[PDB]
Amino acid sequence: LIVTQTMKGLDIQKVAGTWYSLAMAASDISLLDAQSAPLRVYVEELKPTPEGDLEILLQKWENDECAQKKIIAEKTKIPAVFKIDALNENKVLVLDTDYKKYLLFCMENSAEPEQSLVCQSLVRTPEVDDEALEKFDKALKALPMHIRLSFNPTQLEE
Amino acid sequence: LIVTQTMKGLDIQKVAGTWYSLAMAASDISLLDAQSAPLRVYVEELKPTPEGDLEILLQKWENDECAQKKIIAEKTKIPAVFKIDALNENKVLVLDTDYKKYLLFCMENSAEPEQSLVCQSLVRTPEVDDEALEKFDKALKALPMHIRLSFNPTQLEE
Numbered sequence A, B: 001l002i003v004t005q006t007m008k009g010l011d012i013q014k015v016a017g018t019w020y021s022l023a024m025a026a027s028d029i030s031l032l033d034a035q036s037a038p039l040r041v042y043v044e045e046l047k048p049t050p051e052g053d054l055e056i057l058l059q060k061w062e063n064d065e066c067a068q069k070k071i072i073a074e075k076t077k078i079p080a081v082f083k084i085d086a087l088n089e090n091k092v093l094v095l096d097t098d099y100k101k102y103l104l105f106c107m108e109n110s111a112e113p114e115q116s117l118v119c120q121s122l123v124r125t126p127e128v129d130d131e132a133l134e135k136f137d138k139a140l141k142a143l144p145m146h147i148r149l150s151f152n153p154t155q156l157e158e
Helices: A131-140 B133-143
Strands: A020-026 A042-048 A053-062 A065-075 A082-084 A090-097 A101-107 A115-125 A147-150 B021-028 B042-048 B053-062 B065-075 B081-084 B091-096 B100-109 B117-123 B145-151
Touching: A020 A042, A020 A131, A020 B117, A090 A131, A101 A131, B021 B042, B021 B133, B091 B133, B100 B133, B117 B133
Parallel strands: none
Antiparallel strands: A020 A115, A020 A147, A042 A053, A053 A065, A065 A082, A082 A090, A090 A101, A101 A115, A147 B145, B021 B117, B021 B145, B042 B053, B053 B065, B065 B081, B081 B091, B091 B100, B100 B117
């Protein structure tokens, strides 16, 4: 992605707290196909640190169960861009937020030659309001996505 | 679905021959999630019979392999609507076609209480042309779809 496509003026401390994954999209079907896909994850909480890094609590499917994982996305020299400095590098890019209702982000598989992107729309509460989803679809118009998912009522899911 | 949403004036004999599944959508994620999902199938050929029924040759994933299946969708009293009169009833509804390039259809799980729909865009050849996909997205605007997939170049897939 380019710098204009990410959020200008992000305050990471204001994204703290509970979130729900409302919709996901990816450039490649296989990125979100297997319930166990590495980048098929549901956000449950964001925990920015005093040092300006972003800790992410996620749920994932595993055998039948719902496993929690905690990953650390570290600040970089570019605002709104964070690096999970794991063995497999992934960048997390915050596209937009209003802090109080919605947050749009992508995970990119930096090493791969193909463009390899998974993006989500997060909401603070399960309320009926489609601003999160309108803003996400507008943001994805610029990107080649081949799969698009939205989470139904029960419960809705995470 | 309603009668206006399906094709007026369909000639079944003109849909005969080779097709490729270019995109799929469903009202529920779980309808197309597992590669083995019953309604996750790729069309390879349509074979209308002299009696006015529609035979469908499909490919599906199975363990690792690509299995062929042949199913019979029988004519009904409603034009463009066909019934697979299997133990589990499914209707096949032709939404639109120009016979020479594209064909839009849905499979409905009639028995279920929830609306349960899987729809596809089929093309005659893998040519670069997006009319199939524009027509499919226009047709799906009227329907509550929660998952949307499109098949990439290799090869592209069936």
